[PDB]
């Protein structure tokens, strides 16, 4: 924590290194979830399945 009347950590636009407002307050890091897309590599139906 840094100062009492303001504790919600956030640095650029969306990181928001806090949660909302706990009684113990204080801020550690951010890891809600982070995963991306998928693609399929094929050689050709008439070549293989």
């Amino acid at each position: 924590k840094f100062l009492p009347f303001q504790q919600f950590g956030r640095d650029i636009a969306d990181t928001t290194d806090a949660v909302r407002d706990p009684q113990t307050l204080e801020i550690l890091d951010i890891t809600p979830c982070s995963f991306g897309g998928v693609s399929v590599i094929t050689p050709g139906t008439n070549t293989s399945n």
């Binding site: 650029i12 636009a13 969306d14 990181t15």
Partner: peptide
């Protein structure tokens, strides 16, 4: 102009300068 084997990057001195000069922006 040709690459210098001493540098692990395997790039020429002019290429290294151009690589260094070119640099929210990358944290979405």
């Amino acid at each position: 102009i040709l690459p210098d084997p001493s540098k692990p990057s395997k790039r020429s001195p002019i290429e290294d300068l151009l690589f260094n000069k070119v640099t929210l922006i990358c944290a979405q």
